[model samples]
Target: AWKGEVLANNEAGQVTSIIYNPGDVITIVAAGWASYGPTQKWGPQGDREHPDQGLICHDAFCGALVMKIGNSGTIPVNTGLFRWVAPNNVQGAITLIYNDVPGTYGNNSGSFSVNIGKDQS
Candidate 1:
């Protein structure tokens, strides 16, 4: 288990201290808000209903909280809350990234505080 704030300006994302293994059931709960710029604020879920949500990350809601485990592909933290089983081939520290188009991190600010937990044998 672990918890931390993921900054919007961090292009590479924030890496958690906890390590995860394959088959682990992961749960993440996020609160607070993030800013793509001084005037743009967003929730962890971002604008999921909009067509432009995936413009930056391709697969996640724009300005949402996206995650990756090891070399696993990215996934959105749907509605600021999410749970899923770890992929069989993925293993490593959890990395959380603020979703936004590349090269735009310079104007981004704020963060989302996330609580992370998992279950496994």
Candidate 2:
């Protein structure tokens, strides 16, 4: 388990957005005013795993990747395939962060799925 923060600020150093991505599954449990506004207005992005798809909020959030699991533990790297369906064109860099637990016997990892084509506008 990891704790993280996403901050969006202007030149004046004012924080515009602050979001938290946590757990094996990326969940936005908290966010700042600006980030919350857009999320509230537009809503989330896609569906989660089977049987538990939209039942969870993170399902529609952008930049979520599907990870693979194996008996030996998470692969040495984030080498996996994921299918992405973008609502619109996207433009930006896609960054995926891979993490490992100390005493886990199975594969444990995370990913980020960015639809660069969706931001094309």
Candidate 3:
């Protein structure tokens, strides 16, 4: 009975959390990772985890990963604690949200609040 803010405590195995166990690679740490300059990019970072080959429009636009709500298939593995890759076995409980969640671009952001996928169907 909780929804909105409560980053990591449903604990399956922590590396940030949400261990739905697909390819299991959840470990996220992002610090001030934002740039698409309206003026050399201001700080506080933008959130949306998809777009590869070292993003920043990924060498051009359509760098999709902008879901104003839900696309909780969840996959981020920029090789760090931000290392995430969980998409297996069509599961449930997908109420993950972040854009400035728990805001910690200094200690880096775990971005918080995620329940990920889990269904043994």
Candidate 4:
């Protein structure tokens, strides 16, 4: 059986890591994420707003991630939705910085990092 053992990363909540072959198009995870209460801020009504001034308040799912080696930018996964075009070349550590603020969507305050590599040694 070519398919010896199999595992899936369907949970879009805590995205961690994955491994895929070259040119293998796959789901980048975090598609349907219904975020909850994370509204924490120093405002008038204690309301937290989205960031357009270079900040990520995060949504129900995944806000976005930044890749090193100039692979930097926002992932299409807004509020937990988007597709990723993985680079066929390069195989190493992909440090994704999740700058999700604690908002009314999900109460996962503070910025953190998620290490998801395409292929590793």
Which of the numbered candidates is closest to the native, going by highest TM-score? Answer: 1
lDDT of 1 by residue, 20-69 (tens): 77667777889877777657687888765555533446777778888877
Assess the local accuracy of residue 69 in candidate 2 as a C-alpha lDDT between 0 and 100: 26
* TM value for model 2: 0.17
Pairs that clash in candidate 3:
27-81, 27-82, 28-81, 28-82, 29-82, 76-84
Candidate 4 residue lDDT tens string, 2-115:
111111111122323444344543332322122223443221111234443333322322333322222323233322213344554634222233434323223533332222
Ranking by lDDT: 1, 4, 3, 2
**Candidate 4 at residue 16, lDDT?**
32
For all predicted structures, in order, the TM-scores are: 0.84, 0.17, 0.23, 0.33
lDDT of each: 0.77, 0.22, 0.29, 0.29
Q: List model 3 lDDT by residue over 13-116, tens digit each.
A: 12322324444443433222333322232222243342343432232221111111123433332212344444456333333322222222122222233223
Candidate 2 weakest lDDT stretch, 10 residues: 7-16
Clashing pairs in 4: 35-60, 35-105, 36-105, 38-102, 38-103, 38-107, 39-103, 62-80
Per-model root-mean-square deviation over C-alphas: 2.3, 18.1, 11.9, 10.6
1 or 4, greater by TM-score: 1
Q: Model 4 — TM-score against the truth?
A: 0.33
lDDT tens digits by residue: candidate 2, 1-121: 1223322211111111212122112222222222211232211121222232231122223212212122111111122222222222322222222221122212221222222111111
